[PDB]
Amino acid sequence: CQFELSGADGIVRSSQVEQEEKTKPGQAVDCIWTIKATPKAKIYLRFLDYQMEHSNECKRNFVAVYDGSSAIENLKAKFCSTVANDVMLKTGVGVIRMWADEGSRLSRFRMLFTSFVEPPCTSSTFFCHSNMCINNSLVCNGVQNCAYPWDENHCKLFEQITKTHGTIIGVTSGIVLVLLIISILVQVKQPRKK
Amino acid sequence: RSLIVTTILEEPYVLFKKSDKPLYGNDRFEGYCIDLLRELSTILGFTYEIRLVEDGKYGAQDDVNGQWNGMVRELIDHKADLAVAPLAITYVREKVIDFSKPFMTLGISILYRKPNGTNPGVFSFLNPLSPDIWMYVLLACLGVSCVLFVIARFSPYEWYNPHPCNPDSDVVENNFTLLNSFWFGVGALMQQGSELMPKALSTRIVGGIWWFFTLIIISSYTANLAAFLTVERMESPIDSADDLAKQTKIEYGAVEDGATMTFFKKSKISTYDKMWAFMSSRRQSVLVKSNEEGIQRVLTSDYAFLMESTTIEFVTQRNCNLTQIGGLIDSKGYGVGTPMGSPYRDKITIAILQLQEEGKLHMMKEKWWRGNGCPEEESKEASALGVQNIGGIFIVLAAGLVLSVFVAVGEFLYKSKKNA
Amino acid sequence: RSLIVTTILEEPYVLFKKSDKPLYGNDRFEGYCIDLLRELSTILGFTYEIRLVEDGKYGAQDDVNGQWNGMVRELIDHKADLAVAPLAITYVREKVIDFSKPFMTLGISILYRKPNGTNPGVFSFLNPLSPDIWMYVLLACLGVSCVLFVIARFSPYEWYNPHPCNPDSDVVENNFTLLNSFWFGVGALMQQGSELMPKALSTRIVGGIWWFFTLIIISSYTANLAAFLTVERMESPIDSADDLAKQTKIEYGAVEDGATMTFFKKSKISTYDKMWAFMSSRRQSVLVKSNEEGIQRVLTSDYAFLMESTTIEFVTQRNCNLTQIGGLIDSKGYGVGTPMGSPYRDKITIAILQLQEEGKLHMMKEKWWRGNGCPEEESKEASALGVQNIGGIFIVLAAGLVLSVFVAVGEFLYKSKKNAQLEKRSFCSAMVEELRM
Amino acid sequence: RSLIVTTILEEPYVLFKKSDKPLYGNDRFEGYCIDLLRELSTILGFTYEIRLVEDGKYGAQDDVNGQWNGMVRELIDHKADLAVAPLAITYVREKVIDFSKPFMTLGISILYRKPNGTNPGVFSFLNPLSPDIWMYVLLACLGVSCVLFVIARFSPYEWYNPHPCNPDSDVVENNFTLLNSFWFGVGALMQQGSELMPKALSTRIVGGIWWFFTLIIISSYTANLAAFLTVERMESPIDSADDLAKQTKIEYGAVEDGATMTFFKKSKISTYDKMWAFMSSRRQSVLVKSNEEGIQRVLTSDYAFLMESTTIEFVTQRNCNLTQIGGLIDSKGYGVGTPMGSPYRDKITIAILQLQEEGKLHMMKEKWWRGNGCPEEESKEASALGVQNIGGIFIVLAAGLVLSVFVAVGEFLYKSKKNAQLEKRSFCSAMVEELRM
Amino acid sequence: RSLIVTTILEEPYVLFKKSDKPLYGNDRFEGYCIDLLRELSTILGFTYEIRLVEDGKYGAQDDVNGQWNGMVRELIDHKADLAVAPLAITYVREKVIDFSKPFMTLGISILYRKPNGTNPGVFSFLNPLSPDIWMYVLLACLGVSCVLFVIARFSPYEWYNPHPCNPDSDVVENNFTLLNSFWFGVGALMQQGSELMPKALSTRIVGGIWWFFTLIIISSYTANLAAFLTVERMESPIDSADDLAKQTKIEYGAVEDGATMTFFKKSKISTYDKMWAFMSSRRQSVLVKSNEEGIQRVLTSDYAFLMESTTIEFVTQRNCNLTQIGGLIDSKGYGVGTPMGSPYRDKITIAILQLQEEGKLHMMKEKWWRGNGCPEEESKEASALGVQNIGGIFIVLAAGLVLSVFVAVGEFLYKSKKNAQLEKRSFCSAMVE
């Protein structure tokens, strides 16, 4: 069930098992993910939704992140609690695992990874945070993909016509007033003394 | 020894601590209701087994079965001990449990959205003047017009000679007719004035006094309008429990058959029997699922929800967009359970009283109920006036125009008929 | 056997059934606590006799002997089995006695007279300007009018040629009479403007200076009125003890040695700490040794006089001029004292919870607090602005009308005597001639 | 003998000498502490060799073994006995190390984007009424004027006998043209009056309604403008920590765990406790990790960024828009670390006291802070109200005058080419005739 | 064994207890410094007898025989011990006795009276609009009137043949003369207007634009004056040492034989030499005997004063008339006295640092320098206006009358000389008739 997930950014889908390997929830389930950034780029992992509700103890259900290849050499962090910190993948190879144990009703594991933390800044790339020039197309792509707001963040006469119906009633009154003016000119030029 | 306390996952009472590394043992839980228990252990001497209940359920029996699913079971079957958690001291439980003395009181109160500064805009005018004066100014204008006319007729100096170059004529000119006096009266109210200025020092006194009265009126109206638009304080439509009854426009509600309905049922004060009659009338949406959806539907529309006082004192501190209109209606007491006949009662009530009258309880309550507080809804009065604030004048103008057309055609036919 | 029930005498709690003939037994005593006792005795089915406590006080531990007093003492030594009185629940008392669950709660809230129903001002036309300015303006109006007249009499560009037929305007007057100049000055002052419009520079400069003076005066007046009204509107009445903390113009109050001052000194919360410091600094400057004298001190000055909530409810219902502000600073209940060991406490607790579930004790409370509560409904303090009482007097208009009528009739008499040359002769003819129009 | 001193690279304190040709040893450093050590050497006669800690950190207690690193580590050991660099004097750093008197004073203080300016739009005079009523007002003026004109041209009352002494002639007409009615309406809207006197019922009633409209519009405009000015004038910009604490919109912050936020962590004071509560409520929404990132955050947003005083001075005097707000929340001293058993501690305390007595180190403050401490004070920004930068658009007058002269010359040509029926015939005659008179 | 603590009687540091009779014993000095001493004793473990010094002194050097009158004198004799009290950390004192790490820091600061706002006459009424717009408006009025006059000549129809009742003669005559054009302008600025309103079209646009300008100006003026008259943010003239270092309306101060000038003399520094030169000039009203005299003098005159950074805080937090302005100038230290080589030096410095890191010292400072606090200076902007605030318009009016009279007699003699010779007798008859 090890599914590759590599590029510049992406979302590890919340409980992506129904289509890759549709496993029965009765048996314990687990699927690992491998991440590769662009050449010469490290990874930043930021959870967007995470709730392992069925316990605050971890012999059954949890999510873990390992650095480098998918080996036991050095666990970056296994997260077993309400909240989940962001993490820095020193290497360029990602490891994401979730262990479930007849607890498939777990809310989700859902995160987002951003590449190019290592890349030195250049005119082509964008600075958001300290050693975080990440731009290949990432500038304001609709996702909060930098450590705190900075990158995708607040980069970006007809108003008076766009009224709900004040403009409509105003222009109806304007037609009335044009009728009035055109009528007025008639007796501007028509009548005289007596 | 060790004691099996029992709590529940209420919102600001006992909630899982927020951390990242795993928590082990009795350090997972966190809240006011369990640090109360910590103080109790410090003053008495305990040993903690904070074990939750089977299924989240305040102990409430089933009449047919005769079982007591909830904390009542673990307080009866001795599989637990004192169950420090919000547990209303009600009559039916008291037979088969023992409750300590309450450590805080309760009651059911209203919940409503505070008003926001959007004036009706129909007539946002005549506000900075009582309508009494608005009527008096018109009737005084009529009175001064009439008296000015009367003074004008009974005067020697109010008669001009038309054709003044010809001194052989009559003196019929008076510059004051049945309508001219009224016209000048109204025209001096608004700071332009007609061209019918008096000539006799007997009526120019009236002119001057009328000028003074209108100057004061206008220069005070402007001041009052500026005062209202500068320091504006909006007030609630309803401000009492009784006001909800005999109103029949707010369409309040309550939780479906929870604890509020239990009170309103059988409540024979009859000040809330009208309340219950209206609730049971529209028993499709006024009685709603739970507290979250209740406050949701309150946020949606005018909906005076009705629930326990402490959860109000909590949720109105986070979402400072609502208000606790009214005071108190009833009183319950959250207590500390204990098995029937256990000696903990008399050894724990004394500790509760010690904490209560030693002053730590109020700080304990405030440390959890506080929240952010009251934000800066105080310096906010920077907005341009719009049609939502000035709309009546255009309506008055249209009415004046149509009345002008009507009276114009009427007078035209009047004169033509009189000639014919 | 029967039950020997002790009791205390208190204003709204236990009273004497007001009677003339001598009655005795458990019938002299009548009150809310008596209602509760009768109800719970009917519920629990007992027979009772009533005895007042002789020493006549709640009771406290006398340190010199470590021995109880009053109610607590007469209860501890099994002389009496029950005590249906507002016996407060507290640490020192609970350690020796046994109570039920409280049949009511209370607090320590703030007495305060409602602010005299939004005190109105009358004859406030001229409030924003001190009277000296008004007198100066009147005198300056007179002076500039007469000066305008004087230069309007001695200068070349005065005489007006009415017809365009090169005539000689040898008339004594052309455009300025004393009344006309005076009332042009007044009209220019009053923002309406008149027709006596100057031509010569000599009068033009006077007119310009006068107009500038009028704009300064009127704009100053309007701004001052807006300032007064916004200052009045901005201030807010006190509605919490925290306002009593920050604000210090009004004064607190307390019955020291009544454990309220003791509550404040023993407290550690910021606002109560600073108010306790305030009373300590004042040290009988604002302090009270009873209730009624404190009530009167509130009735005579901006006095807070913090009191327990129940008596505050009673007072603010008997009277209608002083009402509580804020909520409940502190909480503490009441009870029904029973000895250290009594199989009556469990059933009395069951009964109190029963009555509370039916809410009957609320009915007795409203019968005795609200029962005397609202037979003297005064008003609702109608809240509005721009009312006729404040800056809405029309009496100056009436004075103008009166003086106009008098002046009109006076100069009509002048037109009669000095221009028809006969008294009581031109009267009837003149008024008949001029009445038809 | 020769002594050894160990320092740190810092922003204003100990910089490496800026040059292109190589520089060496004691002659390759510059800044504050180098000058201070130079004066200490001149006042005590040392032989100092300067060097850095390979770790290059303040040095702090490490919980892995209870050991230390950096200056503290090498100073408990013996590689040097002096450290002339900002090294906060704290309990953990005082238990083992020996410190001299503080030669400078520190403190955590907030930093804030100063009020940038008024940011005035010259059309701010047009602000109090929304840009929807104005077109309503203009179109209503057109409509009311045209209705007045059309009524005045059809009425059995309006037509008037012209002659001043009229013996029943037959030359009657009205006086209302399009221009007359239009400018009557404009004047009434403008409150300066007009020339026409409405006579019939219809014209007078429409005039009265129009007057009522104009009066309330003008009064509401003045009221709203006064509202803006008197609600802006009573705004209170933040000037202290507690006043900041009451405020909510401006998010807080600090460099996390840099011994600054920890002060809020372990504090006991109520105001700082609620500060820390807000800190924890936001919790990496606003808690910056590095100084310069927070600096840019405050530049581009509203923020506080509580950080130590000296760096705030070094930044504010090296930039603009940033204002030192408030005072000194805490108190630390910058000593000169020494080992326990050493004679130089007392000698150096005497030396630096002598330095501080003369104000010499205040002059070092001037040199490394103030010499570049007023290169960016553009002005002192004399504050007041009622300037031409707000509501001072005279360009309206310019447009009016140019349009008026354009239409004037256009109609001047019109009356010659068309009304005189021939062009160029009477140009020069017209100018001469209307010029020489 | 107990300690031999010494203490000087400084007011907001040590105090004789409020009550007297049931309080007899040499353990009844209390105050902030006493709180520090007691907490120090608890955290260290010892007892102290608080013996007052025989001669009231911080301590001071005496040149004649090295005498050190004050607690310093006996503090080298070892007759006493740790002496918590105000005691500077100056160079000369450190030479003979040891010190500790200061428990607070202070300097010299400016003491001055709070602004009051008895605002002047003439300036006050036209204050709202800044003097720029006033002259802009006068010039604009002159220019608008002049251009109206210019366009009047070019106007086609203003030529209106007076009395057109007889068209007999084409007497084409004028209106909108330059004099009356300026009159129309100046009477249009003020909200009354003449009767010479435009009777043509091209001039009517100028009239309308002028009317709009007048309305905008008057409404804005009223709004801004009603703004100033309900907020009234008073402003202080001096706000820094260099600020009053160059003015002369405000006078400096000092304390007789006070350390303030001792530092402030031989300043050698950029700006402070100037004010020492000034007080050197008038050394008769600058100095006062002690701090209390300076307080009284600043309460009397417009008298800027120069005491320390703490006593200013103590005085200004109990008498809400003064105000601490500027900031710090110098830095000194308050520590604890002790003889050389005593074991208590580091043992007390560690405790003081511990307390200062715990925040205890801040709580003691706040509680012993709190006072009632600054009162509510808010609910008082209800002031009926008086001549004190608008009076200048009356002077303007008087100037108008006098200039009017002078111009009237001038134009009278102008007409007279248009008629007859310089010597006047007939015009006397004209005046009499």
Ligand SMILES: *[C@@H]1O[C@H](CO)[C@@H](O[C@@H]2O[C@H](CO)[C@@H](O[C@@H]3O[C@H](CO)[C@@H](O)[C@H](O)[C@@H]3O)[C@H](O)[C@H]2NC(C)=O)[C@H](O)[C@H]1NC(C)=O
């Ligand atoms: C407080 O400010 C908000 C901001 O606009 C306003 O609340 C508004 O309240 C009204 C009802 O009081 C909402 O009207 C709508 O009515 C329809 C009727 O079917 C219903 O479907 C909607 O769900 C809603 O109830 C209006 O939407 C709501 N505004 C917003 C933005 O939700 C109002 O100005 C202030 N509140 C009050 C009670 O005046």
Ligand SMILES: *[C@@H]1O[C@H](CO)[C@@H](O[C@@H]2O[C@H](CO)[C@@H](O[C@@H]3O[C@H](CO)[C@@H](O)[C@H](O)[C@@H]3O)[C@H](O)[C@H]2NC(C)=O)[C@H](O)[C@H]1NC(C)=O
């Ligand atoms: C604000 O109000 C205070 C309180 O009245 C004003 O203080 C007054 O200041 C003047 C100096 O401008 C003092 O004048 C002095 O008077 C004494 C005797 O009265 C005389 O011996 C001195 O030579 C000097 O002339 C005046 O005494 C003082 N008021 C009091 C009650 O002492 C203050 O001027 C007002 N304005 C400001 C801006 O502070």
Ligand SMILES: *[C@@H]1O[C@H](CO)[C@@H](O)[C@H](O)[C@H]1NC(C)=O
């Ligand atoms: C209300 O009346 C009482 C006495 O009748 C008086 O003492 C009090 O001052 C009045 N209220 C106010 C606000 O003046």
Ligand SMILES: *[C@@H]1O[C@H](CO)[C@@H](O)[C@H](O)[C@H]1NC(C)=O
């Ligand atoms: C308040 O009203 C009550 C009776 O209505 C009475 O005490 C008195 O008239 C008032 N007391 C005041 C104003 O102090």
Ligand SMILES: *[C@@H]1O[C@H](CO)[C@@H](O)[C@H](O)[C@H]1NC(C)=O
């Ligand atoms: C106003 O403040 C903003 C802060 O983002 C700044 O960019 C801008 O330059 C300022 N404007 C002026 C006129 O100072």
Ligand SMILES: [Ca+2]
């Ligand atoms: Ca006018």
